[PDB]
Write a protein that binds this ligand. Structure first.
Ligand SMILES: CN1CCCCN2c3ccncc3Oc3ccc(cc32)OCCOCC1
Length: 274
């Protein structure tokens, strides 16, 4: 009843395992929104809102992380349809997938990749403080507000509530999966997120993902195809340490030499995103 009137639906932005996302405009404020339709049959992880109502995990996670300014695309609303869930998320404008961005612009200058990695870390870190693990940190799940240089996390469909215990489930792509998921199908939230941050930083500074097969991941040896500062190489190879315990914390990532002199998102929009 309130969905089709409150929001004007537009072109399909994307469709896939996340469902079908449409460009939308909230008639209330002419605000750019993304309308994410998720069929219930395809929903794997369910949870209960504090209100006492059963919803997709992504709703729970977003509601926990969408209180306050964050590098996370906020859940503005949600609706239950008969066989469908409809999430109204923020739509930055103009905006691009970090995936599309990289595939177009090739490897990223370390100044851009530094701004971008730091913003991703602030977002993952905000999620962690809200008790949320994203579990699918990848270039497709990072949007780029191009006028503001702001990276914004999306797609918590594969995420979960932060647990200090072991996770025995993963719905991310095998190339982003930590070697401990590959060998043991067990992993720990923070350390696996740091692993995916290493994969993401490699992708940023290199234009491509470091490992395409399980064997290269298990091996954990990382080869650079682009000129990548010795310091950035150390950060990546640290985040991609085979042992999760040897992996850096978010403080240790952010307090790392390559993560120094990070440009604010506005400066990075002027210097790199026109
Ligand atoms: C091929 N890409 C991806 C389109 C779907 C991404 N999509 C989401 C997907 C899963 N979960 C949440 C999402 O929220 C969003 C918020 C704003 C958006 C898009 C999304 O507009 C940006 C356009 O991005 C570039 C097009």
């Amino acid at each position: 009843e309130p969905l089709e009137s409150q929001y004007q639906v537009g072109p399909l932005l994307g469709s896939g395992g996340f469902g079908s996302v449409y460009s939308g405009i909230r008639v209330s404020d002419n605000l750019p929104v993304a309308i994410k339709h998720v069929e219930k049959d395809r929903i794997s992880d369910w949870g209960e809102l504090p209100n006492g109502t059963r919803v997709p995990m992504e709703v729970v996670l977003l509601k926990k992380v969408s209180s306050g300014f964050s590098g996370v695309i906020r859940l503005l609303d949600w609706f239950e349809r008969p066989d469908s869930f409809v999430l109204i998320l923020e739509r930055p404008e103009p905006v691009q997938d970090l995936f599309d961005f990289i595939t177009e612009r090739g490897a990223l200058q370390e100044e851009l990749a530094r701004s971008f990695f730091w913003q991703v870390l602030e977002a993952v870190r905000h999620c962690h403080n809200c008790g949320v693990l994203h579990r699918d940190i990848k270039d497709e799940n990072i949007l780029i507000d191009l006028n503001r240089g702001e990276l914004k996390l999306i797609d918590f469909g594969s995420g979960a509530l932060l647990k200090d215990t072991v996770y025995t489930d993963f719905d991310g792509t095998r190339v982003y999966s930590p070697p401990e998921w590959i060998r043991y199908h067990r992993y720990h939230g923070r350390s696996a997120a740091v692993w995916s941050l290493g994969i993401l930083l490699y992708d940023m500074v290199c234009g491509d993902i470091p490992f395409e097969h399980d064997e290269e991941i298990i091996r954990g040896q990382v080869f650079f195809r682009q000129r990548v500062s010795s310091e950035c190489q150390h950060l990546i190879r640290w985040c991609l340490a085979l042992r999760p315990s040897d992996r850096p914390t978010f403080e240790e990532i952010q307090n790392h030499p390559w993560m120094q002199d990070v440009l604010l998102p506005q400066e990075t929009a002027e210097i790199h995103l026109h």
